Amino acid sequence: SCYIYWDKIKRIASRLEGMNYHFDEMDTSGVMPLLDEIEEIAHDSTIDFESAKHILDDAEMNHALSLIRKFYVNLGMKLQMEKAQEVIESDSPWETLRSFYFYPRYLELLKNEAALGRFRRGERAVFIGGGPLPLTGILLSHVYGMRVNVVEIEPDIAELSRKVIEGLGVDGVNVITGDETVIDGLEFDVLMVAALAEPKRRVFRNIHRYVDTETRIIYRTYTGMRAILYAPVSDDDITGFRRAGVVLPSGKVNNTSVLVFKCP
Amino acid sequence: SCYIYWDKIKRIASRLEGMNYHFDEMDTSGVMPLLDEIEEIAHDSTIDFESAKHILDDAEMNHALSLIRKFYVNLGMKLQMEKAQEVIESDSPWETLRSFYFYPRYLELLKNEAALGRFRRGERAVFIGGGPLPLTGILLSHVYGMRVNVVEIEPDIAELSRKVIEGLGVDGVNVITGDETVIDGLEFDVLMVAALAEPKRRVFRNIHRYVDTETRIIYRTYTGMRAILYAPVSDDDITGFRRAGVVLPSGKVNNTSVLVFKCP
Ligand SMILES: N[C@@H](CCC(=O)O)C(=O)O
Ligand SMILES: N[C@@H](CCC(=O)O)C(=O)O
Ligand code: NA
Ligand code: NA
C-alpha cells in the first residue's frame, strides 16, 4: 500500500538500529523524544485495525517492528527501575511515585479495569508480573481497597518491589517470589496478568490449571496500531478461556484490557 | 473455548439444514424469523472482534458459516426482487419503498457514509452493482442531491431498476448496463462499491486502472461478528489502495464502510 506511517516507522527504526542503545547505557531522559514519536503513531485514532494489521504483519516490517518493540520494552523497564529506586530514597515517596511518566495513564487504565472486573473493596487480587515498580498492585490497594498479592519471578526484582511498597506504606500489598505457578498457594477473587507476563501461552496454561470457572481474570494486550509497542496476546494463547468483555483504550493508554473466564 | 454464541450458531445452522426448501425457492415471509435469529447474533455488541474471528475462522464452523451466508444472500436478493416489482406496481411507490425491510438501516448507513465521503449536493457519484432495487443510488439523488450513475451487469436486472427509478419519479439517477469497466469514460467525484459487487479482486483491479489518486472511493464490507453474513473484503483485494477512514456499524446496520484512495 502507501500509508504515510510506513516511512515514518522505518525512519524511527533506522535511528534505533543506528544508535544501538544498550540497556545499561541508554540515557532514559535523552531518548524520551523517540518514545513520543513512537507513541504518536501508536496512539493515532485515524488508523483502523485492518490497516494496522496490514502494516505490522508485513514481512518487510518485521525487522523494524522488532527494533521498536525492543526499544519500548527496554526503556519501560529502565524507567521502572529508576523510579523504584527514587521512591525508596525519596523524602516524599508518594509524590515521587506520582511523577512516574506513566502514572496518569495507569489511573485511566485501572478505572476502566475496575469497571470491567466489577472490583469491590476488600476483594482479594493477585497481579502476575509485578516488576520493580508494582504500580498496578499499589493502585489496587490505594485506590480500590483490594487486598493484593503481587507475583514476581526475579528474586532481586521482587525484593526491590518490597522496598518500594514498604517505603510507601501502602496497606495490604504483598510480593511473592516465583512464576505464575505460585497462585496454587493463593486464594483470590480477581487475577490480573501483566502486559509483560511471559511466555503468554504457558502463563495461561498454568492459570487454567489453578483457577475455577468463576474467577474473574483480566489480561492486558495491544490492539490496532498500539501493537507496534508489543506483541498482542493471541487467541491461541487463551485456549481454555472465553472472552467476556474488552476495553479498547483511547488517549495515551497503551493497553487493551480483556476479561476472561475459564471454560468448563 | 466455550462461547454461548457457538451453540446458538450451530442451532440456526441445523434449522437451515432442516428446511426442505432450496434457498432460491424459499418463501420470503416464512424465513424472516430465521433472519432475525442470525441478525441477533451478528448485531450483538458484546461480541468483540477477536472472539468473532475465533468462532468464524474455526474449522468446525466452515459449514455452518457457508450455510448461513448462502441463506442470507439468497434472502437478500429475493427481498430486493420482490420489492422492486412491488414498487413498480404501486400507486404509492415511495410508501412501498419505505416498507422495505432494510430501508431504515440504509438511512442510517448513508448518513454515516455521507460524513465519511464528505458528500455535497450536485457532486457526481457512481455506484457499482445496483441490483434490482438501486436503493443507495436512489438515496444519493433524492436525499443527498448527487448526480448518480448506477452500474448493473445483468441487462434484465438493469432494466428492472430503471423501471423502479421511473415509478418513484426520481431524477438524476441513470443506470448503465455493464461491469465496473464502464467507469473509464465517466467523470465522478465519488465511486461506491456495493457490498455485493463481485468478484472483489477484479473489481478493485479495474477501478485502480481508471481512477486517479484524488477520487474518494467507498466500499462496503463486514467486520466482527457481522462477518457471519458475508465474506469480508480482504487486504489483498485492495492492493494499490490505502484506507483513509472506516465507519464501523452499530444497531442493526450490517455493513462496515471504508474510504480508500488509489496509491501514487
Ligand atoms: N508495570 C507496572 C505498571 C507501570 C509500568 O508499566 O512500568 C505494573 O505492574 O502495573
Ligand atoms: N443493495 C441495495 C440496498 C438494498 C439491499 O441491500 O437489498 C443497494 O444497492 O443499496
Ligand atoms: Na511494574
Ligand atoms: Na440493490
Q: Is A127 helix (H, G, I), strand (E, B) or coil?
A: strand
Which of B111, B243, B105, B174 is CA-nearest to residue A3? B243
The string over B159-183, giving b where at least 16 C-beta atoms fall within 10 Å of a residue's C-beta and e elsewhere, is ebbbebbebbebebbebebebbebb
**Grid coordinates standing for B109?**
448507513
- Binding site feature residues of B for L-glutamate: 106, 136
Three-class DSSP labels, B71-132: HHHHHHHHHHHHHHHHHHHCCCHHHHHHCCCCHHHHHHHHHHHHHHCCCCCCCEEEEECCCC
Contact A207, A194 (CB under 8 A): no
- Cα distance between residue B43 and residue A256, in whole Å: 22
Answer yes or no: is A239 a known binding residue.
no
- Cα distance between residue A224 and residue B48, in whole Å: 13
Q: Is A126 helix (H, G, I), strand (E, B) or coil?
A: strand
Cβ–Cβ gap B2/A264 under 8 Å: yes
Q: Is B179 helix (H, G, I), strand (E, B) or coil?
A: coil
Cβ–Cβ gap B53/A235 under 8 Å: yes
| DSSP single-letter state for residue A102 | T
Q: Is B38 helix (H, G, I), strand (E, B) or coil?
A: helix
CA B206–ligand 3 middle distance (angstroms): 53
- Cα distance between residue B160 and residue B175, in whole Å: 10
- H or E stretch at A246: strand A241-247
CA B24–ligand 4 middle distance (angstroms): 17
- Cα distance between residue A66 and residue A200, in whole Å: 18
Indicate the angle between helix axes B4-18 and B28-42, nearest 10 degrees.
160
- Cα distance between residue B194 and residue B220, in whole Å: 6
The alpha carbon of residue B34 is apart from the nearest alpha carbon of chain A, in Å, by 26
CATH of the domain at B169: 3.40.50.150
Domain extent, residue B47, equals 1-264
How was this one solved?
X-ray
Indicate the angle between helix axes B155-168 and B62-89, nearest 10 degrees.
50
Number of domains in chain B: 1
**Grid coordinates standing for B82?**
420482490
- Cα distance between residue A60 and residue A140, in whole Å: 41
Considering only CB atoms, which residues of chain A are within 8 Å of chain B? Answer: 1-3, 46, 48-51, 53-54, 223, 235, 238-243, 245-246, 258, 263-264
**Which numbered atom of ligand 2 lies nearest the CA of B134?**
9
The alpha carbon of residue B52 is apart from the nearest alpha carbon of chain A, in Å, by 10
Cα three-residue angle A176-A180-A183, rounded to 5 degrees: 70
Q: Is the dihedral of CA A197, A200, A204, A205 positive or negative?
A: negative
Other beta carbons less than 10 A from residue A126's beta carbon: 28
**Grid coordinates standing for A198?**
511471559
Q: Is the dihedral of CA A88, A90, A93, A99 positive or negative?
A: negative
Residue nearest to atom 3 of ligand 1 (CA): A135
Q: Is B24 helix (H, G, I), strand (E, B) or coil?
A: coil
Which of A137, A128, A154, A148 is CA-nearest to residue A97? A137
Indicate the angle between helix axes B155-168 and B135-142, nearest 10 degrees.
30
Tell how far CA B124 is from the center of its chain: 20
Resolution of the entry in angstroms: 1.8
Three-class DSSP labels, B66-79: HHHHHHHHHHHHHH
Query: Where do we find the cell 493508554?
Result: A253
CB-side exposure of A166: number of CA atoms within 13 Å?
A: 10
Which of B144, B198, B207 is CA-nearest to residue B173? B144
Residue nearest to atom 3 of ligand 2 (CA): B135
Tell how far CA A31 is from the center of its chain: 20
Show Cβ contacts of residue B167 under 8 Å, excluding neighbours closer than 6 positions. B87, B88, B90, B93
Residues of B in contact with A3 (CB under 8 A): 242
Other beta carbons less than 10 A from residue B135's beta carbon: 22
**Grid coordinates standing for B118?**
464528505
- Binding site feature residues of B for S-adenosyl-L-methionine: 136, 152-153, 180, 198
> What are the DSSP calls for B144-155, one per residue?
T--EEEEEESSH
Q: Which long-range contacts (CB under 8 A, 24 or more apart) does B199-207 make?
A: B200/B233, B200/B234, B200/B237, B201/B236, B201/B237, B203/B128, B204/B237, B204/B238, B204/B239, B204/B240, B204/B241, B206/B179, B206/B180, B206/B181, B207/B128, B207/B180, B207/B183, B207/B262
Break chain A down into helix, strand, coil percent, rounded to 5: 50, 15, 35
Helices (H) and strands (E) in chain A, counts: 9, 7
- Cα distance between residue B222 and residue B220, in whole Å: 7
**Grid coordinates standing for A188?**
483470590
CB-side exposure of B94: number of CA atoms within 13 Å?
A: 6
Answer yes or no: is A153 a known binding residue.
yes
Three-class DSSP labels, B188-257: CCEEEECCCCCCHHHHHHHHHHHCCCCCEEEEEECCHHHHHCCCCCCCCCCCCEEEEEEECCCCCCCCEE
- Cα distance between residue B35 and residue B27, in whole Å: 13
Q: Is A206 helix (H, G, I), strand (E, B) or coil?
A: helix
Tell how far CA A149 is from the center of its chain: 17
Cα three-residue angle A142-A145-A147, rounded to 5 degrees: 100
Report residue A198: phi and psi, to 5°: -140, 160
Q: Decide the pairing of beta strands B216-221 and B256-262.
A: antiparallel
Cα three-residue angle A128-A133-A135, rounded to 5 degrees: 70
- Cα distance between residue A67 and residue A20, in whole Å: 9
Mutate to test the pocket of ligand 2, among B35, B103, B106, B144 (most ligand atoms within 8 A of CB): B106
Residue A109 carries which side chain, given as an amino acid letter? L
Show Cβ contacts of residue B80 under 8 Å, excluding neighbours closer than 6 positions. B131, B132, B133
The string over B91-118, giving b where at least 16 C-beta atoms fall within 10 Å of a residue's C-beta and e elsewhere, is eebeebbeebebeebbeebbebbbebbe
Which of B209, B235, B180 is CA-nearest to residue A3? B235
Interface test with B, best of A221, A242, A258 (most B CBs within 10 A): A242
Please state, in angstroms and as integers, the Cα–Cα distance from residue B132 to each residue in A37, B77, B102, B231, following that order.
51, 8, 14, 21
Tell how far CA A68 is from the center of its chain: 16
Q: Is A245 helix (H, G, I), strand (E, B) or coil?
A: strand
